[PDB]
Curated annotation (Swiss-Prot), chain B:
It comes from the Eukaryota. Belongs to the TRAFAC class OBG-HflX-like GTPase superfamily. OBG GTPase family. NOG subfamily. This is Nucleolar GTP-binding protein 1. It is found in: Nucleus, Nucleolus. Coiled coil: none annotated. Involved in the biogenesis of the 60S ribosomal subunit.
RNA sequence: UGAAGCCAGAGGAAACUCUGGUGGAGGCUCGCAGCGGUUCUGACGUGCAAAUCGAUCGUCAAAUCUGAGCAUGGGGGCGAA
RNA sequence: GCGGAGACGACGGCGGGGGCCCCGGGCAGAGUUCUCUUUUCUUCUUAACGGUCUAUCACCCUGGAAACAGUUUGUCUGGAGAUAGGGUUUAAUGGCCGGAAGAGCCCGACACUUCUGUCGGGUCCGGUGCGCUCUCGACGUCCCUUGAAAAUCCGCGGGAGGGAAUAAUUCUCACGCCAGGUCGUACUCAUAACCGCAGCAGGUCCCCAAGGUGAACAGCCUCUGGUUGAUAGAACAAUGUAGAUAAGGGAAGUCGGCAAAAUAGAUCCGUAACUUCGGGAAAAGGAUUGGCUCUAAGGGUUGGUAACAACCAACUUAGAACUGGUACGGACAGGGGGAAUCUGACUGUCUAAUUAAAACAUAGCAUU
């Protein structure tokens, strides 16, 4: 059995009260599908909070960071943050949320 | 969206205006002054030869039409 | 064409050097009767005949 | 302000068509000051010139239609337009069948189920179109073996 | 381009007067070091695994021949 | 090319590794003479040719 | 569309006959390009054009289409005339 | 002196290789997101030149085949030596390595007036084929048609001359040394760069050629890459040019069914006279065709009557239920058919710019 670890780092918008980490965790629990069916996590995917506005995922299947990024963008679109928040991979399995570049006008 | 004729420019290629972003966050109901978006928002022979290159591209050396006549009148 | 002989390229070189208006100091000479280049050639108007 | 030269140079630098070049409309004087490829590259690095992405041509409908045709949809007489031979050639079908039968006969002779004389006459029957498929050839071999075994038991 | 499989022949190739240049390329993803010497006709490449032999070969090379390490980006 | 490099060497004392020649559309020949790495083209153009 | 050649089965003393395949012939055939130029109270008629435009039509593996080099010169040449 | 290469037609199917097209996984980025979509799209590349290992024919050795065998999609091969066993060799646009990741491409973080950037992370693993294109190989077909030459390069037969003692060599081996002159090279190649008096709807020789539907370089729609150029604004009379429909009747119209309408793809039933026996023929006349959910048949590999299970892959074909309907080749594309007469045998050719034909040619025949 292999185990993969994923970090979603929403520390800056979570500190800025832009991003709701608990709501994001609930969204992940109700939208991550296993074998094509939602609500089938069991012992294969565990989703938790390691604090500091970060969400940690343990997977024992072939769960993809591309799938996690797709679900994160779906949550940002639902929360009207898609035009303002960007999901960028920074390490192997670590995706952070950050503002797009801003110009003084 | 105009995806039949052309693709959407990616969001990372466009600088987001601070006024619009602050307005959208104010619509969403957060304190922008408590987070401070102003701080986050961005804002010799060789020399003679280089001058000769610049002047060579800028100005033509001769003028066969008008080099035979001197004086403004 | 791009493929050309030396004789052809030499005659084209002479035609290129001839293709110019008259100098402006010509018209200020005393007794001058030349007002323009009356043998001026253009690539769309008259053929060189080579 | 004319920017035709800048658009052509930016297309050459970015390695795309001129219809994929984006010049910043709020920076037209600074783009117009760029007459060389080095200056165009500097503007590209600054982000004032970007290459637009390609227009969508998805294959999703083609893939769903392929799966439907694999499971058997859209194969009716109203969907067929070419002749049966133009759709699947009889020569291709025959060549596949002959190769399958000859491969099976070689396998059986190599394994020793049939001997060489039986192999030869079955080869010529398969060429003379006795067997329409592998199961037919196998059943013919089995009935021939049954007849040979009955003859051996009688003798 | 020719491959040298062995360090001593690489050394007399570097000792030859035709030996114009010499460089060291390190591949960390593959865990190997290539020693390359440019001569009159050919470039000779010697491939070694990660060992003390590469660093020991580096002083074992002739000192008149310039040995250079390959940077991460080949700038023009 | 041989006459061009000989003329450069005898008149201006310039050593060249190779010379490429073309003939221009006006009918004159143009020569690109690459110099040896020991001599400096900028120095030669500044001193002898007066091209600064 | 399916000529020779070939395979199998059934007959026939045999020569042959029948059935089913295989094979891929033809100055064969429908037809895309190309080449040609049948028809139309066609368009146009001081035209886009001193022969063009549209639809329709003939032919389309060859007595097919075509470039360059070369030959034939006016009492001539060339001519599926 | 002998020989080989240069050095050779057209057409058809089959097999190998490269490239393109297609499918799956993974990293990174992008877009969509009322709802759905582990989603859709983009990059994931590897040159010349070398080293090494391989690649059908062909040839060699043993042996001696009828109960004839081997074998192709296509019936050829074999006592002039087959099958089988064992080998030798020509053939790379094949595998690995060097080239070469340092390149190229994608992504990221800081820096950044310019000058300049600086530093990271990747660039991975498979599958499929009556696909398209090029190439190579073995076959086969046709000819009263048999499908260049030369420069140049190599092999052999022959045996002329020739030996070395502080080196001889008449060695196509490795390394080392030197050199490569002249002329062309921009750009267009066409609804504006050529010819047509012109920036003329004409004409003018080639190469590369994506996705969908479909038999299909048909028509129609899309990607890459290009254009958005052809005097414009308003109104909607007559008469025009181009495109259409029309109740009832159905050629009464007209010199004349001119023009239009009707037919049309595919599957299946069926198809007359005549005939040079090859044809006629898609003759004629009929039945049907959407969607959805299924079923059945058609392969390869592995595993010990295995005549059995598992796994993998893609396209055809047949059968059945259900279901919408005014239409089901729903656009596109796409024969009207028949009974006769005259006429030229047929394919073919000509009056460029009023005649394409019973004219010409043709094979066959006859004469000098």
């Amino acid at each position: 059995k292999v185990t993969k670890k994923f970090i979603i780092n929403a520390s800056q918008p979570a500190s800025d009260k832009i991003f709701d980490v608990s709501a994001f965790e609930k969204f992940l629990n109700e939208r991550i599908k296993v074998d094509g069916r939602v609500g089938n996590l069991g012992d294969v995917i565990k989703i938790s909070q390691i604090g500091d506005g970060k969400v940690e995922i343990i997977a024992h299947n072939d769960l993809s960071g591309r799938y996690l990024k797709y679900l994160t963008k779906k949550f940002l679109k639902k929360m009207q943050l898609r035009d303002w928040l960007r999901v960028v991979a920074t390490s192997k399995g670590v995706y952070e949320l950050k503002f797009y570049n801003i110009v003084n006008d | 969206k105009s995806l039949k004729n052309r693709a959407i420019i990616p969001r990372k290629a466009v600088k987001k205006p601070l006024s619009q972003l602050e307005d959208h966050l104010d619509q969403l109901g957060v304190d922008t002054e408590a987070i401070g978006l102003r701080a986050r928002a961005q804002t010799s022979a060789k020399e003679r030869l280089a001058r000769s290159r610049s002047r060579a591209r800028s100005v033509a050396a001769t003028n066969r039409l008008q080099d035979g006549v001197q004086g403004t009148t | 064409p791009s493929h050309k002989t030396f004789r052809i390229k030499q005659k084209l070189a002479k035609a290129q050097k001839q293709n110019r208006p008259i100098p402006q100091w010509i018209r200020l000479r005393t007794g001058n009767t030349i007002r323009y280049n009356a043998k001026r050639r253009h690539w769309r108007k008259t053929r060189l005949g080579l | 302000v004319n920017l035709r030269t800048q658009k052509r140079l930016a297309a050459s630098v970015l390695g795309c068509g001129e219809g994929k070049v984006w010049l910043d409309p709020n920076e037209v004087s600074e783009i117009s000051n760029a007459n060389s490829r080095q200056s165009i590259r500097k503007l590209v690095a600054d982000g004032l010139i970007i290459k637009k992405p390609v227009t969508m041509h998805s294959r999703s409908r083609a893939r769903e239609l392929n799966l439907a045709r694999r499971i058997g949809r859209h194969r009716g007489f109203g969907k067929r337009k070419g002749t049966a031979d133009a759709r699947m050639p009889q020569q291709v079908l025959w060549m596949r069948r002959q190769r399958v039968l000859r491969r099976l006969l070689v396998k059986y002779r190599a394994s020793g189920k049939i001997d060489k004389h039986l192999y030869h006459e079955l080869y010529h029957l398969a060429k003379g179109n006795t067997f329409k498929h592998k199961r037919a050839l196998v059943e013919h071999i089995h009935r021939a073996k049954a007849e040979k075994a009955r003859e051996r038991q009688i003798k | 381009p020719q491959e040298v499989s062995d360090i001593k022949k690489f050394i007399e190739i570097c000792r030859r007067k035709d030996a114009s240049s010499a460089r060291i390329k390190k591949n960390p993803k593959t865990q190997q070091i290539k020693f390359k010497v440019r001569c009159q006709r050919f470039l000779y490449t010697l491939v070694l695994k990660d060992s003390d032999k590469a660093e020991k070969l580096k002083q074992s090379l002739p000192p008149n021949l310039q040995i250079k390490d390959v940077p991460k980006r080949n700038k023009r | 090319k041989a006459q061009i490099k000989q003329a450069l060497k005898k008149l201006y004392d310039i050593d060249t590794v190779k010379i490429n020649t073309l003939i221009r559309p006006d009918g004159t020949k143009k020569a690109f003479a690459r110099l040896t790495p020991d001599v400096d083209a900028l120095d030669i153009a500044a001193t002898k040719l007066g091209l600064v």
